[PDB]
Amino acid sequence: GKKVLIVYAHQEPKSFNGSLKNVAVDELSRQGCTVTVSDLYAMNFEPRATDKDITGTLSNPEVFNYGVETHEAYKQRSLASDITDEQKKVREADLVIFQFPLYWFSVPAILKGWMDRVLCQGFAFDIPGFYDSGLLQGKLALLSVTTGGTAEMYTKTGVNGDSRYFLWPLQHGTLHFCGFKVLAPQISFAPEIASEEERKGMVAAWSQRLQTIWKEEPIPCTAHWHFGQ
Amino acid sequence: GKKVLIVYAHQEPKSFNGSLKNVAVDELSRQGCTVTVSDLYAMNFEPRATDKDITGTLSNPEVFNYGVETHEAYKQRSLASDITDEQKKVREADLVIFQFPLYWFSVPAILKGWMDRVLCQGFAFDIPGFYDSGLLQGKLALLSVTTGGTAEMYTKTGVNGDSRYFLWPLQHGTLHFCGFKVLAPQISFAPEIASEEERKGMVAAWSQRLQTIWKEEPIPCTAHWHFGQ
């Protein structure tokens, strides 16, 4: 049996993102997987890293160091419940799919805050204690991203550069750093400009891909995969 | 005379980031510049891109598209006032400095939300009217970043890859996209690991650079600069 967490960051259930999230739930559910969705906007998920993320009293109340305090809070079971509820989902998951629209060559802020606050020292990594020594090894992650820009813009000599270039902070600096094996990204380019046929194509590619997702090997999450040449 | 906006993202006034923000204010003030700081945590700045960012009648109330609705709201003057407040600061500024700790090879979520919400269509870019034709043409931007990782970790053959690689979504995908000229980044590596003497040096290096900031040329914000290809 396999467990999947979908971390979903779109405001609108009728959106293209919503449909990709819903086809993932439908297909993984059909396969008999255990499926959980964190719908961040619906949850009004807190993005800001603040001292409210620690319950009780601080490791150093005179000078606030978010990383130190959250690490100590993790070890002492004193993190805020919104964070520990997400950590439980991640701990249980074999695969974490992130479904989002590209905002400024990155994730929407609400999802950036999920990464900042949920993947804390002691849970996802230690110092030292990262990349292959990270704490989420064994797990798979997958970025399912939609863009405004066309595929052709996202080439080496296109205006936006290769799409792999923007993946680096997410794939390498975040997911690989925490120990995930990273499956190849799903990138659904420019659905707002696409026709209905093409947008079905994209949804159906994704549903089709999901049928065999458990048979994929991860990408080599290297500086060479992203940039090289 | 020159106007500077510092967009600052750290929870703790006594932090290394707070020090670097203060020395910027002090130095630029000493030069006779006009200086404004947006202290995002102190402001409790809203990072989430939601339908609360538009106060008027939506273009399409059945299906919410944040980009479309914020573009129309900008033209109509129905955006939330926290957004308009920031836009005014940007509009008036000759130079925008971003002062932040690196979180997951990127900006903290509160600052991601500033980018997501403040830099809307009509204000920061138009389609057409992006990259060299972006609406913030003539303005300078500069990222002043602090890290956990050391400079050696952030080299082409270090565990983190070259520091320029993480700059791409920020400098190119965001700032250059909006028409900014990008000054070379200020990266203060690993202050937590550094000796007191080295920290004092990194602070003084920033102050000294600021003495001559108005004589600098921007970087060529290209894939070649960031990746060497």
Ligand SMILES: Cc1cc2nc3c(=O)[nH]c(=O)nc-3n(C[C@H](O)[C@H](O)[C@H](O)COP(=O)(O)OP(=O)(O)OC[C@H]3O[C@@H](n4cnc5c(N)ncnc54)[C@H](O)[C@@H]3O)c2cc1C
């Ligand atoms: C703050 C901000 C920053 C951004 N920065 C960038 C950037 O850096 N780079 C970039 O490339 N883009 C950028 N974008 C654009 C953004 O990535 C796209 O607008 C987004 O990816 C579009 O996805 P969506 O789900 O919102 O599309 P939607 O508008 O929801 O949908 C696209 C179309 O598909 C339709 N649809 C929905 N479900 C289905 C279905 N099942 N079958 C067929 N059609 C369906 C919808 O009805 C709609 O007509 C930015 C946008 C914002 C708001």
Ligand SMILES: Cc1cc2nc3c(=O)[nH]c(=O)nc-3n(C[C@H](O)[C@H](O)[C@H](O)COP(=O)(O)OP(=O)(O)OC[C@H]3O[C@@H](n4cnc5c(N)ncnc54)[C@H](O)[C@@H]3O)c2cc1C
């Ligand atoms: C969610 C999260 C994700 C992160 N992801 C990454 C990542 O991807 N990559 C990465 O490399 N790092 C990462 N980090 C680490 C983070 O970038 C560093 O912790 C941060 O940059 C350190 O800066 P600071 O201002 O917080 O340091 P501080 O801890 O405030 O300062 C360091 C020291 O300098 C002292 N100091 C302050 N002012 C002065 C002064 N004027 N002169 C001398 N000493 C002074 C302080 O008292 C302290 O002792 C992450 C951290 C978090 C919390």
Ligand SMILES: [Zn+2]
């Ligand atoms: Zn990697």
Ligand SMILES: [Zn+2]
């Ligand atoms: Zn550029």
